[PDB]
Structure formats: C-alpha cells, structure tokens
Design a protein around this nucleic acid. Structure first.
Ligand code: VO4
Ligand code: VO4
Lengths: 322, 322, 322, 322
DNA sequence: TATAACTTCGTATAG
DNA sequence: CATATGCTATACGAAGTTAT
DNA sequence: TATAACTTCGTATAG
DNA sequence: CATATGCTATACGAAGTTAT
DNA sequence: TATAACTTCGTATAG
DNA sequence: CATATGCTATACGAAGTTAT
DNA sequence: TATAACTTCGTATAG
DNA sequence: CATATGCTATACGAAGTTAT
C-alpha cells in the first residue's frame, strides 16, 4: 500500500517517459471509470474484476467501438500494472468479456474504419486547381498536402518540422530531417526526400511566408485573414488545423459532408498516408520500400494501411475483363 | 482449488469469447483425451506432462498430421491456461516430444496439402459448358463459382451475403458490401466488386431465383429436385452445400474421385481463392496486392499457393537464364 | 539428484528431438572432457567451474580453433542445463575465460575460414568441359553441381531429395520440394526451382540412372566401376561422397591441392552455396531475394556468406581505376 | 559479500575477456559515478536505483549525448552483473528516466554526429595539391590517405599493417593481408587490394622510408622534423597520429577550424570510410557490397552515410517524378 | 583373390 | 544457424616526451 | 633555447 | 559494430566395404 | 464589435 | 504501432431431413 | 414411394 | 489466418481566442 503510492509517484515523477496522449487518455479513462464507479457504488481503486467486467459491458451497451472499449480496459491495466498490482485483465472475467465484446460487435457488423484515401489522382486534381492561387493560405495548404503525400508523415510529425530540419540533395531535392515519430525516438532520426515538384511547392511556401527568417521557426504556421503568415519558433500549427486543411480541400471539390455524424466523410489527417501506401502497392513497389516510405517494420502494419484498396479497379476485375 | 471451478464458470458465462468452431474443437479434443486417459488409467484433468506426452505419441501412431497433433496440444493448453493451471506445453517432456514428432513426420514424407486450384481456365471451361444451361441449379452454381473466383471470399462469407448487401457501381458493376467482416480490422476490405461478366451471372441467378423479392434474403439458397429455388432471410445455404458445388462441378468435368481417400482430389471451398491468387501472380500482380485481394496477412500462405509458378522461380533461375 | 537422472533420461528418450550431429558432438566432447578429467583428478560431472576453465585453457594451448573450444563449452552447458543443473557458463570463471580465449586467439591472427567459392564462371566452365560426356558418373556429377549452385541447398538436403519430391512448372522448369533443412522442419517445406539448363542436366541424369523406377528412390545414388547407377529408396549417397564430387571437380580443373593441411584448398560441400551468394551480391540482387535463395531469415547471415568477396575485382579498385 | 569479492577477483584474473578500450570506459564511468556519489552522499557500490536515476539526470543536465548517458548506464550494468548484483537498468526508476531522457533530448534537437566525408573528389584534390612534394612526411601521408580510402580499414587496422602483410597480384597491384581481424568472423574479408594508383603511392613511401628493410616493420612509422623516417617492428604509429594526418590535411586546404568546439569540423579517422561508402552508392554499388567493402554488418550504419544521395531518395520520389 | 567408388567414423570447425 | 543482449571502437583537446 | 612531430591520457560518443 | 545461447550443420583423412 | 482562421479540449477510435 | 503468441476457419464422409 | 438435394455432425487439418 | 500487451497516435465537434 505504501509501495503502491511509491509506484504511482515514480510513474508521475517521470511523466515525460510517456506520450502526453498516453496521459491524456489515462486521465480520460480514469474519469469515466471513477464516475461510473461512484454512480454504481463501486470502489474505483484497486479495481475489482467483476466491477471492471460490468463497466466494459456498460461501454458496450452505450454502443462505443470495440477499440474504445479496449482503450478503457488498457488504461486500467496500465494503472494497475504500474502500481505493482494485478491487472484487471489478469482475471478470466475481464479478459474473456473483452474477447466476447469484440466478437459480438464484429458479428453484429462492426469493423474498424480508416481515413478516406488522398491518393495521387487526388493530389494532381488539387494541384491543378490550386497551383495558380497566390493566396498565402493556398500556397501553404498545397505545400502541406505535397509533403503529406510525398513523405507519408503523420500530421504531428509535419507540425514539428523546423526550417533547420530542411537540407538539400546535390540534385536539388529537399530533405526533411525527422527525429521523433510515433514509433521512433532517435538522435539519428530519418530523412524524408521530396520530389522536385513537391520541393518547388515547399519553396513557394517558404518564400511567401518568410519562415526562413529564423531557422528555429516551424515550417508551417498559421495564416490570418489578411493573407499574412505568422512564423513562430514556439507554437506549432495545431494538428487540428492540419486536419482542417484536409477537410477544407475535400469540401472544395465535393461540397459539404452530410450530417450522418460518421467519421471519415471527408479527407482527414491520415488520408495522404493511407493514399500513398495504396498507390505504392498498386505500382508494384517492393514491401521493403513501402516499409521505408512509411517508417514501418513488418508486413502486417502495411496490410492494415492498404486493406481498403479500391476493388472496382482491383486486380480481379481487371483480370476478368478486356 | 475452488479457483479452477470459478475459472471454469467464468469461461461458461462468457463463452461467446470464442467462436463456436473453437468450442467444437475443444470438446472434440477433450473427448479424445479423456477416452485415451480412461483407457490408460491416467487422470485427464489436470493433465500430467508424462501422460500428455504418451497421448501425443499415440496421435502420431494413429497417422494424424503434425498440425492435428498441434490442435490437440493447443486445446489442452487453453483448457489449462483458462483454468489457472500449468500448460502441458510448458514441460520438458511435451516440448521434447513435439520436436521429435515434427522431425519424424517430415522425414517420413508428411506433406501439408492445399486446395486444388480453381483457375481462370477452369472457370472459362465451366462457363462454356454451363452458361446456356436452363437448370436453376446450374444458374445458381455458376453464379457461386463466379463470385467465389472474382471476390476470394470464403464460403462462410459467401453464404452470409444478403441481397441488400448488393449495390451498383457507376460502371454498372455489382458491388458487394461485407455485412460481417471476419475480424475487426478487415484485411480484405469492406466490399467486393464483381466484373461485368460475373455481374451478369449473378443478375441471372437473382432473376431466376426470386431472391430479390425481399432485400433481407440471402443471395444464395437451396434449389430442390424440381428446380424451384427457396429464398430465405433466416436460413443460409450451408458451407457444406457450397463445398458440394465445387465438388459436383469437378465431377462434371473429370468424373468420380480417385479412391486414395486423399483430401483435395476435387475442387473445394478454398479452391477459387488459391486459383485467383495464382492467376494474379501469373499476371505479375505484386504479393501485397494478391494478399489484400484475398485478405491474407501472412506472406507464406500466399507463397505456398504460387511457388510453383514460373514468375516466382526466384533470382538464381533468372541469373542462370540470363 | 534423482531429478538430474530423470532429466537426462527424458533427454535421451526423445533423443530424436535433436540432430544426430548434436548427439555425435555431445559424445565427442564428453569423452575429451572426461579423459582430461581422469588424467587431472577432476570430477567430470557435475563439472566444477575452475576445472572447466582449466580445460578450456588446455584446449587453447592445444592450438584448437575458437569455434572448437566454443563447441566443447557449449556441449558441457547443454549437458548441465538439460540436467537441471547450473551451466559452467553461469560462472564468471568460465564465461570470462571463453571471451578471453576468443579475444587472444583473434588478436593473434585467428579468423574463421570459409569454403572456396564455386561460382557461375566455375559452373559454366565445368559444364562446357563435361556436358558432352556419356559416363554415368559425369552426368550425375554435373546434375549435382547444377542443383548445388542453382538452389544453394546444403549437401545433406541434396542427399535427401527423392524422385517424388520433383515436379514441374507450366513452362517446364523442375521444382524440388524440400521439407527439412538445417533451420526448417515443416510439412509445408520449400520449393526450389531449377533453370531450363539445369533442369535438362537433371533429366539426363534421371534417364541414364533409372532412379525414376521407384518415386521413393533418392535422386542421387552411387555409380559403380562399370558405369552403372545403383538407385535406392533406402540409402542416400553420403554427404562425404558429395564433398568428393566437389573435390574431384576441382582436381579436374586445377589438379592436386597443395599440402598445407589447411581446409578449403579445393571446392567442398558448401562451395556452391557460398559462390551463389557472392554472385547474387555482385549482380545487385535485393537482400530479400538473396534471403529467399539461401532460405536465410536475416542480413547478418547473408554477410557471413558474402564476407570474402574478391577485393581485386571489388568496388573500390574498379571505382579508383575509372 | 564474499561472493561479490570472488566475482570481482574472477573479473581481474580474466582481464583479457574485455578490450582495453572497454576497461578504460568502465574506469572512467566509475570515477564519474563515484565522484558524484561522494558529492551527493550516496553509496557508490552497490548502486541503488534512486541514486543512479539522479546521476543520469545529472548527466543529461551536463549536456552529454544520449549514447554517452547509455555508456554510463551500460558500464554500471556490467559492473553489477559481473559482480552478481542487481543491475541498475532492471529497476523501475532507471527504466523510466532513460525513456524520459531519450525523448527530451531528441525533442530539444540533439542530433547524432557523423564523420565529415573524405570522398574521391577530396582524395583527387589532395593528391594534386601534394604530389609534387618530396618530403618524407607528405609522401607517407598521401600513402596513408590512399590506403584509408581504397581499403575502408579503420585507423587501428592501418596502424597494425606490417610490410610482410603486403604481396603482389598478377595485376601488378598491392594486396594487404589482414593479420588481425576485427572479429572471429571477418565481415570485411581477410585481405584488401589496392588500385594501381594507390599501389604507386605506397611504393613511393616504402622506397623513401626504408620500411621494407625488415618485413616485420609496421608499414607506417613516425617521421621526425628533419624529414627522417624511423621504421619500427615493435612500435606502431598511434591512431591519434593517423587522425592528425586527416586533420592536418583538412587544415592545409580550409585552414584552422572553428572555435565552436563541435565534432567533425575537419576530417577524422572515420572520414574515408564514410566517403568511400558514399562514392560506392553514387556509382550504384548495392548496399550489401558496400557493407562488406567496409565490414559493416548493420544496414542502418551505411544508410546513415548515404541517406542524402539522390540515388537513395525512395519510392515516393520515383512515383512522383514519373 | 584387385580396385573404383564408395561408406563410416572421429576430431575438428563453420554456420 | 535463428535469436538474444552490449561491448569496442574512434574523437579530440591537453599534456608529456624526444630528437633535432 | 624553440620546435616538429609525435605519444599518452581521460572523457565524450559512434560503430 | 559486438558477443552469447543452444544448437545443427560441414571438412577431411583414414579405414572399412562391396560389386565388378 | 465582427470575423477568418485559428487553438484548446475532452471524448471517441485507429494504428 | 512494434512485439508476442493460438484461435477459427475449411474438408469431407456419414447420417439425418423434407418436399417432391 | 424412392430421391434429389440438401442439413447436421464429428474428426481432421489448413488459414 | 488469428488476437493480446502496452502503448501512442488521429478524429472531430464544441467552444474559446486574436489580429485584423
Ligand atoms: O549452412 V549456413 O546457410
Ligand atoms: O499511424 V500508423 O503507420
């Protein structure tokens, strides 16, 4: 019990060992679990397996996604494991119910969704539509989409790019040094190469924004309504705004998304990453090169990305016709 | 103690944590193991290492495949793990004997089998023999085989398709939404498009069968001796019957099965997935594309199917023939 | 102590879990160690750390290779670990002296040797010389070298090939099923494709030898004095004889090897596996394709095989002389 | 406490189990750790996790690189493991801070450094600037730079070359036999061939220095201020002097380096290895041949060197520029 | 019975 | 050999050494 | 006596 | 870049075997 | 005082 | 997401079932 | 009335 | 094929913020 308090304090003390998003969800889940405990007369900590079981069953009846329910279970597991206590999932009651909730939801039609693909044909369409615009916001957005599609970088990684991270190949192509991604923490990092065309889009953005005035400036910054950019070395353009760029670009071409409240009605932050992975598969690029493009280490994760390859233009339709 | 009894109640209560197919195999292995134990004066639960070892040697002596023997071990392992008891696999005796058995069976020439391929050449031959057939039975079966080859869905998934899952592409093709995916993250996607030719076969079956009188009806239904189809929203055609279609089609072209009692002497449930994979390889479709077309995540599953194709003979052959 | 006895009994009773070669070397090491023990008044089992250290240092003074000394240590470790006793290498005296012996010997000039490469140029040369021969012995030997080079199979794997393991591709190339290799024991196994030229060499061997009389005959067999092959389903051509084909083929081209006592003066069993790896590196074959050819799982083992690439015709000399 | 005492004595007895460079670092880290402990009133041995944690945070604050902090942890780990003690790394507190330190340093912009490349263009330029010199020192330095670039040998390996390691091919080229390999299994091979031009550079040095008088003489030796070489069979040129050659050559061309005490402002001992790897990549030499040319075993070391060449820009760049 | 062409075996060493 | 887990090298400023 | 041209050393960090 | 673990192969001289 | 074009936030869900 | 580890499908002969 | 054409089932094995 | 572990990311509606 004194040990438990020690263990939690040690975890809190070295806070920055974890992603800030891990903490955010720990706290979000604890809040949800503690609120449910209070209303149902249960002790929130240590958590009893039968209580956790009941709580997961309640999340299922709320109609939450399997992955949501797993996230709640998982945060509860971590809180116990890192306290030095048994995990809820160490008991059959919890581990079996989680299995059950997954099978039942899937059998009822649930499957995990994926960002709408922003693909080469989309990039070309957007390029031809927007390339001539001299609005600073459009110059920015096109450079952003170019990088997103060319490097497959996640939006948080793109948001973190500083001017000093940009260098050049002998042949003129931009190279973006990346040191931290979702899966990589390294002082060696990776370089992401941009094509000659995407290099030009980025230079146009660097040129009208003036972000190069200080190499500590983040590459991307906000653009106020007077078409003026606000470079900054301390605030990133939010990943929310990067999502917004994808959504506004989709809206430009296809109009307003309907009102059904479903996710991925329009392009979102992961859309170019999914799109480029699909184009590479279709073009016959070798697995190891797809891996390198996306910073992936195994084939399963690649399959996760290309799982929704368009069927109508797929291999089997083309083979059967013509 | 009373712990195991509680663990087993939790298993029963949340029995939907496992597929019906998993339970049926657990019970089947349990009957075999208990029968053998009763015969040999051994306690069947908890399983003792020396006893499991002898049982596994008896399974080998019986002529069971390595993978069958693994199933028996795996099922006993699961019963024990979920009971909170030691696994048979976690012992020196069982570990050694499995190593021995694998080695001996491989040297004795035991081979893993796979479905006889149902390929484009086969599909075309059957088309040209059956497409004009008046028979309702034949119109159904051709549409089945076309969907099987075109989509690479498994028989259970084809049996699940409902009329309401079908829509039309702008190209005029049929598009089949997957109502229930095999897993939460559906490696094969959420829809399957049919070529123009296979769309025609399916349209034909729909119009002749009357299944579209009700959107909730399963696409496929039984057809009685009088050639009248019996559409239904509550009863699927069995996977057994779908295998019978593959077998009956093979019998049509090659006559009755050889008598060796081997598996895969005629086409079976898996035959069109193996065939389509082969046809895609022949056409130079990349491995990741082949894999998502059929929903595979393990490279070696697909390699087993395509490794005897000239296009897949490897670098040394290419090097020598240069 | 009763437990130790039971542990060894269990190891010996499933002796087939291990390779015949592992047992062969266990016994060879035990008699060396037991004999040294006898002569030095030590107890051979359990082995005391200070005595093992003394023994290792004596192996070193005998001028034995680092890999040999590691083999002796390793065999003692296994004997102990599978007794349920502490390994000699669990003590500092032993693990430390092993590192020391290896460091001192390397510092003094010792490096691991490798089979002399049998490469494409060597194969073409031998083929050009021998392809016109009508002696059964030559036809065999040419088919053997072709398989060895085309497939990289180790000689034991080549010795186990049976006639029934051979099939064909649609384009007419031979395929060889292999179920057991040094690193793989699988009922799925692996398929090894032959070029058209190599395929034609094996066909010639099959037709002159009559091995095809029984699909259970080994592909290669002894050929007596009179030029008559003696096919068998019961005895393999020994790996020693297969080494002899390599050594004899080397003598045919370069005459007698000198009298260094050194290994690898002439081609041996591993020569074509090494030579094929090297030709693939030099031709720019991708790492995955090299891996597939050798049935290797990682890059380090590939580097092990290509480590002695000729430097006189290597990349640096060529670059500098341009 | 007597076990630990014996364990350390065992470590002393088999000193030579580790490189002198490993011991030098163990002692250096122990000095730093014990000095910090005295200051902070902590017990230095056995090291407690809370204390090691505070120490690691102190190393971070000092501005030491991640890899340096790992060296300190690693050496404490070894000392504890070979003592029979709990390793600082095997504790919650140390695990958590290392994870935290890694993230924060990468986020602060810490970047791993890399030797300044000494490429073909540098080598040619140096040759044409210096080839008119008749000074013994210059002639040596030129021969040294040629060997460094041509062979990709490490400075310690170049310092160990004896005249008797050098023989001649039928091409007229010098061939350097590697007397002492880096490892038992030598990734770089057992010999290095010189181009004709670099052979000429080395002939000139041998002729002016008199090293060939005794074949046991090290190839390179010191040259005092009166331009007189001092051949030796028992004394090597230090690796520090070889670094000094690269440094002085850079200074001659570009003048004195920066005040900003950064690393790699001038060429150093690794420069020719990095340079030669880059020239090979530019020529289209495959990664594996590059790796064996420099004795590298890990693909990502090489990739670090060449990641900014247009040749290595990846699949997405290829797709977009098509 | 004489020998080509193997096999078997042990120590040794590579993968 | 497929896997598991750190050791062993270079970098470089400074200070010591030895023949000019 | 100044100095070139090293070697030795200890800490920092890459291979 | 390194070496460890717990194997499983090949190397080769020498001596034994058997159908000509 | 609007307003475009964001940022912040908390929950939900994918990778 | 990188990593570690078993579950969930089809195969098929046989025995039942139900509307012709 | 047999009977086509299924369905259900249990063990074997591939995905 | 499959799903668990222990994370670490994105999705997005809502509501709040600041140079114009
Ligand atoms: O035998 V090593 O591939
Ligand atoms: O973001 V997942 O590659």
């Amino acid at each position: 019990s004194d040990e438990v308090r020690k263990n939690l304090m040690d975890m809190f003390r070295d806070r920055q060992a974890f992603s800030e998003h891990t903490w955010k969800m720990l706290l979000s889940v604890c809040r949800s679990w503690a609120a449910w405990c209070k209303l149902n007369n249960r002790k929130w900590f240590p958590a009893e397996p039968e209580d956790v079981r009941d709580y997961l069953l309640y999340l299922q009846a709320r109609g939450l996604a399997v992955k949501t329910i797993q996230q709640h279970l998982g945060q509860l597991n971590m809180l116990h494991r890192r306290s030095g206590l048994p995990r809820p999932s160490d008991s059959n009651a919890v581990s079996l119910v989680m299995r059950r909730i997954r099978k039942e939801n899937v059998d009822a039609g649930e499957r995990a969704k994926q960002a709408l693909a922003f693909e080469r044909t989309d990039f070309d369409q957007v390029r031809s539509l927007m390339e001539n615009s001299d609005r600073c916001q459009d110059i920015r957005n096109l450079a952003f989409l170019g990088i997103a599609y060319n490097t497959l970088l996640r939006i948080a990684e793109i948001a973190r790019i500083r001017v000093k991270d940009i260098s050049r190949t002998d042949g003129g192509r931009m190279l973006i040094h990346i040191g931290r991604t979702k899966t990589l923490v390294s002082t060696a990092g990776v370089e992401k190469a941009l094509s000659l065309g995407v290099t030009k889009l980025v230079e146009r953005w660097i040129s009208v924004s003036g972000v190069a005035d200080d190499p500590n400036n983040y590459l991307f910054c906000r653009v106020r309504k007077n078409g003026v950019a606000a470079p900054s070395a301390t605030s990133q353009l939010s990943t929310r705004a990067l999502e917004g760029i994808f959504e506004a670009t989709h809206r430009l071409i296809y109009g307003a998304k309907d009102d059904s409240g479903q996710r991925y009605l329009a392009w979102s932050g992961h859309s170019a990453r999914v799109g480029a992975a699909r184009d590479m598969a279709r073009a016959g690029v070798s697995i190891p090169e797809i891996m390198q493009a996306g910073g992936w280490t195994n084939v399963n994760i690649v399959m996760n990305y290309i799982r929704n390859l368009d069927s109508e233009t797929g291999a089997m339709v083309r083979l059967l016709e013509d």
